Amino acid sequence: EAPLLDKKWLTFALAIYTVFYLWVRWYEGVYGWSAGLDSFAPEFETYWMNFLYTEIVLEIVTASILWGYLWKTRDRNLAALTPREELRRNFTHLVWLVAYAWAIYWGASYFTEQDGTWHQTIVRDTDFTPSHIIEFYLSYPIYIITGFAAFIYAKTRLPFFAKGISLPYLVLVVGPFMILPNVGLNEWGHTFWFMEELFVAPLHYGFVIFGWLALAVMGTLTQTFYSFAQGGLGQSLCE
């Protein structure tokens, strides 16, 4: 008779992102000045290019392992899922959504405007600035991994989402992912199209457009609520 909501998992989901991104901010503060200013220097290499390579390799490994583990341990027979266990799985999926929202805030909101700050205070020299390394290649893949994991868990554990591919969930999960390829346009926007460090330039409208797809969350939320209510919780609550 485990509790319906696992408080330890929710606390871990918040705390791991909080601590990791606080350490990332500390690293940016410590080494963003001594080594990050000049891109053709050895300290810049050993303090940011190594960071980029390590983060890319770790992101690939983590995404592969997590997605493969979630897809391998799927519930083959969901017809025997008891309503209480279905409610517990719904709470776990809600914890996954909480983690995805926290990662989305950390990526799209915090580090994007930090990148804006960095570009307004220095002269851009390379596409692999420390700000670009942290924002485009660390936070965006992290929230992409979290969203893919949440979608896979919902599809493989919740009977509500197991009957097909949820269009609002697919838009909410893949839409922000398209922000990562669009970075190329951003680079093509800064190197060829726009000669000025203007944050409202059209070369950034790609980001904006895919950010709009995050609004799909509302539709997803509705489905989630029905997944919470179809198991008998709604009937008891309406009384």
Partner: protein, 241 residues
Amino acid sequence: SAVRSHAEAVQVSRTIDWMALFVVFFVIVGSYHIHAMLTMGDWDFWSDWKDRRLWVTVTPIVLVTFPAAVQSYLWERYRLPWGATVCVLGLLLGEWINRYFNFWGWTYFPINFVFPASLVPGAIILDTVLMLSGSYLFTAIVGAMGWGLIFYPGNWPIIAPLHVPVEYNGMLMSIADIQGYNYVRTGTPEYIRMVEKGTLRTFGKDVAPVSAFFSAFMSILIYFMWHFIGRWFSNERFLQS
């Protein structure tokens, strides 16, 4: 059954309410913040970009986007009238966090030079109009008019002390202008700022009201379009491939 009693169902519903509020709030923070900054953030970053023509015109038009969709979802499905307020609060929270911890905590730009614009009154007007009228067309028209018109009067108490004239080295300057001059933005030269410079067709002290009315009209249009955009975004559809 999933729950064993009505009280347990109520407690579970309250927990779901808190968690879903967290999810909605922070997903809105991320998406609205990225859209808002990449649409109008140059005027929002610096106090010397807060002019009477471009800032007043542009900011409400591009910022009325998310509140329209979130209202169209929340009021229709839950009768929750706080969509615009929650969007504005999330955007303000993200902006202030970045200003304090990155603009000032990292690059040491003074807070009085890098502060966001106030947006709560417009969201409150929109939300109250939607709640009291109950119709999206009247809400669109009147609430968007109010949202466009109240933007500059709401921010005037903040930027008014920054417009005291100064004789700086023989030239007339504003306090915000001196702030922009002294604190060097290496990546942001002076010619980039989209501020009013005066036109031969500019008339007798009508810049700010004209900008406000134009912003209100375009806010009506953008609210009308983004209401249906959010209605599409709220679809509960399932695909088989």
